[PDB]
């Protein structure tokens, strides 16, 4: 059985978050929690939330043992971009993309 | 392009803009612009020989 959590429209840039998600993929729920706690990146805050929600879903909804959980899958998708104006010299107006992420974590049970 | 509602202003100078050259936005090359050889009202009737 798998459990899954998704955070959508998180206002962080996918490239930056993915770097963190990479750290916990395939890891135990237990190691993942340790890793995120001391990962010096803004993304770690968000990825932590998704991690926990999935574990919650696992235990509370899908009859999975918190002790057997691990990160079977995890991926960051691009959500819509907030296009913003950045004023520059000599009258030119640039456009900034406040990018946005869809963080997904999927948990499974280590039957071993 | 002359029946379309836009003005006849040249949208930006001919040269040194870094962009393609254009006139008014009613040009058939523009989205929203006039259409080229599109239909007009027409009389499709003719006079088939009475003997026929």
């Amino acid at each position: 059985m798998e459990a899954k959590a998704i955070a959508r429209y998180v206002r962080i840039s996918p490239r930056k978050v993915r770097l963190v998600v990479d750290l916990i993929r395939g890891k135990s729920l237990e190691e993942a929690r340790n890793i995120l706690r001391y990962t010096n990146k803004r993304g770690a805050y968000f990825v932590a939330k998704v991690l926990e929600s999935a574990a919650a879903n696992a235990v509370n909804n899908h009859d999975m043992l918190e002790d057997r959980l691990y990160v079977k899958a995890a991926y960051v998708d691009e959500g819509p971009a907030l296009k913003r104006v950045l004023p520059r010299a000599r009258g030119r107006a640039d456009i900034i993309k406040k990018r946005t992420s869809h963080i997904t974590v999927i948990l499974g049970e280590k039957h071993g | 392009r002359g029946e379309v509602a836009y003005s006849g202003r040249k949208i930006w100078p001919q040269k040194h803009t870094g962009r393609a050259r254009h006139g008014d936005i009613g040009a058939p090359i523009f989205v929203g612009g006039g259409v080229v050889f599109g239909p007009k009202p027409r009389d499709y009737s003719y006079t088939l020989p009475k003997k026929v």
């Binding site: 000599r90 | 930006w12 100078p13 040194h16 803009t17 870094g18």
Partner: peptide, 19 residues
């Protein structure tokens, strides 16, 4: 070394008003 002084082909570049 060339003796017949050879004239500039290009002008000194000058700025344009920027649209």
């Amino acid at each position: 070394r060339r003796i017949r002084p050879r004239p500039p082909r290009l002008p000194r570049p000058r700025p344009r008003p920027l649209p």
